Symmetry: D2
Amino acid sequence: GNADEXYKEXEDXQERLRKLRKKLR
Amino acid sequence: GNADEXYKEXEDXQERLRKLRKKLR
Amino acid sequence: GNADEXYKEXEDXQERLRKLRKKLR
Amino acid sequence: GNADEXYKEXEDXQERLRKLRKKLR
């Protein structure tokens, strides 16, 4: 409903930050 | 300096999302 | 329970990013 | 360049959290 939708959005943000840290370093 | 400090803050936010996902699930 | 807890955590992350953007610019 | 692009990505993530808070509530 919105539990899985949110979870998915959280892990997409975690992964975008992982990526942005690989860009900076 | 500037880069190292930004890198560490991005890691901190990534780690909070990692914890939020566990709290959600 | 966890609806308000999550909401609060989301707005803290939004505010940390606002802050980090004021640091960069 | 480097700064402008990082600034814009931080703004994009901030805007996603802004939207998630509305979806949660």
